[PDB]
């Protein structure tokens, strides 16, 4: 029933709002200045990065050169994101009933693809929102960081620019994310069929969502399926830069949650 597919779409959106503090809607309102809220502090060089030490708050408490501090910062944000996404995954009907090791597998291989999907919502061509909109770091400043770190985020800005041109909203994104998490082809899944059945229904929900929400863009569904494939490539490039960094540099500390996810991740 199409009605049930709209009800599912709405359930996912409502769960998505619950799970993720900064939505695309709110992020766009910030990036365009439509909001009543105080403007993000702009980090555009080393000096402004230093000044931002006070203004910007991080949820984690932390009583190294700049490039490293920024990289570690992205680490900790990623750790936050994994927990938010885990909470969202658990709201997808059927997910918590799957074999628990399969849940772990879906998350392990899914989370980075979701991170970069959602990161796009915080990006425009000029930079990215950080710490729930409290700060804005320019694409140029990140690009200006010494190698390998100057190339760390550029692949993602390039993805976001093209992805954002599709003009998805939070309602589209909730279903798009759900489909990705419920990928039956992740390495090492034990019980594939129940995941495939769940994803098949989510895909129907996505197709109907896009037909209704983007009436004039027939091609959007086929393009989003390609973006899913693309996202895997973005994650591959990221993992390989991660190995380069993990060697090109004298060792920094990697968060154990990320260490666990990285293992066997390509």
């Amino acid at each position: 029933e199409s009605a049930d597919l709209r009800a599912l779409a709405k359930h996912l959106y409502d769960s998505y709002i619950k799970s993720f503090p900064l939505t695309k809607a709110k992020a766009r309102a910030i990036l365009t200045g439509k909001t009543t809220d105080k403007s993000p502090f702009v980090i555009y060089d080393m000096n402004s990065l230093m000044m931002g030490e006070d203004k910007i708050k991080f949820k984690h408490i932390t009583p190294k050169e700049v490039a490293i501090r920024i990289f570690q910062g992205c680490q900790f944000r990623s750790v936050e994101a994994v927990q938010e996404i885990t909470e969202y995954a658990k709201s997808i009907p059927g997910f918590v009933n799957l074999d628990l090791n399969d849940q772990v597998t879906l998350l392990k291989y899914g989370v980075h693809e979701i991170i970069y999907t959602m990161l796009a919502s915080l990006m425009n061509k000029d930079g990215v929102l950080i710490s729930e909109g409290q700060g804005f770091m320019t694409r140029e400043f990140l690009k200006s960081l010494r190698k390998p770190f100057g190339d760390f985020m550029e692949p993602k800005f390039e993805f976001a620019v093209k992805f954002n041109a599709l003009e998805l909203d939070d309602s589209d994104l909730a279903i798009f994310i759900a489909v990705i998490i419920l990928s039956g082809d992740r390495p090492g899944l034990l019980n594939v069929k129940p995941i495939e059945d769940i994803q098949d229904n989510l895909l129907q929900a996505l197709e109907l969502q896009l037909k209704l929400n983007h009436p004039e863009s027939s091609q959007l569904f086929a393009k989003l399926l390609q973006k899913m494939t693309d996202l895997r490539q973005i994650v591959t490039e990221h993992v390989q830069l991660l190995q380069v960094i993990k060697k090109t540099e004298t060792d920094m500390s990697l968060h154990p949650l990320l260490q666990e996810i990285y293992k066997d991740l390509y």
Binding site: V82, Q83, T86, K90, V96, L100, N101, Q103, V104, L107, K108, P256, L257, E260, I261
Partner: peptide, 10 residues
């Protein structure tokens, strides 16, 4: 695993 613990916590 850490991911398993996150999945199990209400």
């Amino acid at each position: 695993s850490l991911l398993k613990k996150l999945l199990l916590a209400p």
